[PDB]
Amino acid sequence: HWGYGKHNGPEHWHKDFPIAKGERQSPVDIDTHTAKYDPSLKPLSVSYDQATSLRILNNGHAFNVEFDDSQDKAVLKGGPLDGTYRLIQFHFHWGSLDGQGSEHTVDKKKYAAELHLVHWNTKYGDFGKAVQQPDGLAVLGIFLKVGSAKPGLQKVVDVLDSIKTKGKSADFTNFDPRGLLPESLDYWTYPGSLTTPPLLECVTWIVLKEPISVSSEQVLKFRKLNFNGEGEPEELMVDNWRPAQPLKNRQIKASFK
Ligand SMILES: NS(=O)(=O)c1ccc(SCCc2ccccc2)cc1
Ligand SMILES: [Zn+2]
């Protein structure tokens, strides 16, 4: 029953998920003047050439592009991370309007949407065990702004008709998530949480400084999705973002000067 309406939205989640008011919740505002350059952070290593996408699913709160994570085919390493993190899925959060939609903000600026590439620490064996560990997940966050189209997103846009409603899935093989990356891998990093229930505090967040641009037609297609199931009253899947949470006792580090 959690969701993003007036009656079950982010301000309600604490009643089922008390960790909502915890010590390391996400997203946060990234105050660019207070994040500290940390010259000891390494370059991020994104190794996606062997990625195997399988399926795309509307789960009633976003859509997930899911990957085969039973071997080291698409991994994230380096940066703030120790060890190897396997890509399991990516999804997006977006707005009803171009002026909102991202979860992280940068000096209080909201982007039109935010992509999360979700990875789990292979020393924990599987995703379900990894979410129980403080260093269990690494999520790569990438901001979307509206402008020129992103060619490598179009295959995702074009399948959304087939997963309009909650519970719908479609084969989605041979999708290359390298086509969703910006040029620069400059990033901010901080310890945080899943941004949907169960809000577990298991995520090293790596948020890229450079946004990707997508076309107005691309984001319009996200906004045609439905939160509801087929044969239920239509509620457009829009504004599926949690707002910024208190930073509390955390420092955001920057990979760049
Ligand atoms: N928006 S986010 O990137 O922070 C994010 C990533 C992954 C999940 S998965 C649901 C949590 C879960 C699923 C299955 C077993 C245990 C926990 C939720 C939110
Ligand atoms: Zn997310």
UniProtKB/Swiss-Prot annotation:
InterPro entries: CA_dom, CA_dom_sf, Carbonic_anhydrase_a-class, Carbonic_anhydrase_a-class_CS
Residues found modified as Phosphoserine: S162, S169
Record's catalysed reaction(s): hydrogencarbonate + H(+) = CO2 + H2O; urea = cyanamide + H2O
Outcome when changing N64H: Enhanced proton transfer
Active site: H61 (proton donor/acceptor)
Listed GO CC annotations: apical part of cell; cytoplasm; cytosol; extracellular exosome; myelin sheath; plasma membrane
Effect listed in the UniProt record for changing V139G: Weakly impaired activity
Gene3D superfamilies recorded: Alpha carbonic anhydrase (3.10.200.10)
Name recorded for this polypeptide: Carbonic anhydrase 2
